[PDB]
Amino acid sequence: AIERTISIIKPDAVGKNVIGKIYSRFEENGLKIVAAKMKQLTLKEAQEFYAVHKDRPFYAGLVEFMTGGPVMIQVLEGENAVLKNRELMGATNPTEAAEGTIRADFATSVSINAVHGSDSVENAALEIAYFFSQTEICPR
Amino acid sequence: AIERTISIIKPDAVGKNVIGKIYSRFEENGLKIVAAKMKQLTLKEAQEFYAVHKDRPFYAGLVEFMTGGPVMIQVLEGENAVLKNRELMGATNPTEAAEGTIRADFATSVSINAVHGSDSVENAALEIAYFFSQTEICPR
């Protein structure tokens, strides 16, 4: 079944200017970019988007990281898109990420890890609606 | 001088899912993406953006082609950004386009030519202002 999921290219990978390499990792693996925008997240936006982590020690650092520079946000469409996005992303620890994943290639550390992707069908709907209106999605 | 120019990945290249490979052409040559959005152009938008060609024979076809599917629009930043973008795009006719250029690798014909870029600094300011507010630009 065809799904839609959010991807965020974090300020580290934007700062490395590897947006295109990451985009090609999706495009060459059966996912299509159907919405996209570059954005400077506010503190409130980073805090709300990651509110699920608000009581964890890494939260303050994560919000600082995610507001420290611009991000590239896109909706990816394709079969099994939620789990396929996460497979292409790889494990958060770059040492453990499988060869050929985005984090294997571009992540600095388990915290500075290049990409976010929605982790479930429900979470993809919420995250897409957080950053996009439906009218911002462009069917092919 | 550190300029800003507009780039459009046209619906042919978007439909081919080579947004990433085109972005890498910009990024791997020093250009930085400082604003970006995927958009479905309206008839009026394509007509106004290309109004300089309204009296030319290819005007009607150019408008149809640019509205047949979504485009990817981005502002590229870097020294000599206007000319550098045009160098990376290559000649309009893919037969005359140099090896390794965008049109040499991704353009279909002189009319289905994969990419647009501003032709002058003054036209770059107008074209950027047409599709983006200044608040949508994300300096690094």
Chain A residues in contact with B40 by the CB 8 A cut-off are 138
Tokens 């990024």 -> residue: B27
Closest CA–CA distance from residue A129 to any residue of chain B (Å): 16
In the PDB record, what is the listed experimental method? X-ray
How does B71-110 read in b/e, with b if 16+ C-beta sit within 10 Å? bbbbbbbbeebbebbbebbbbeebeebeeebbbbbbbeee
Provide the H-helix boundaries in B28-119.
43-49, 59-67, 81-89, 102-106
> Do the Cβ atoms of B138 and A40 come within 8 Å?
yes
Domain of B95, in residue numbers: 1-140
Helix axes of B81-89 and B121-131: crossing angle, nearest 10 degrees: 80
Show the tokens assigned to A106: 């571009």
Q: What is the CATH number of the domain that holds A102?
A: 3.30.70.141
> Do the Cβ atoms of B140 and A69 come within 8 Å?
yes
Count of C-beta atoms within a 10 Å radius of residue A30: 15
Q: Are A20 and B26 in contact (CB under 8 A)?
A: yes
Q: Does B61 touch chain A (CB under 8 A)?
A: no
Instruction: Give the resolution to one decimal, in Å.
Output: 1.9
Number of domains forming the structure of chain A: 1
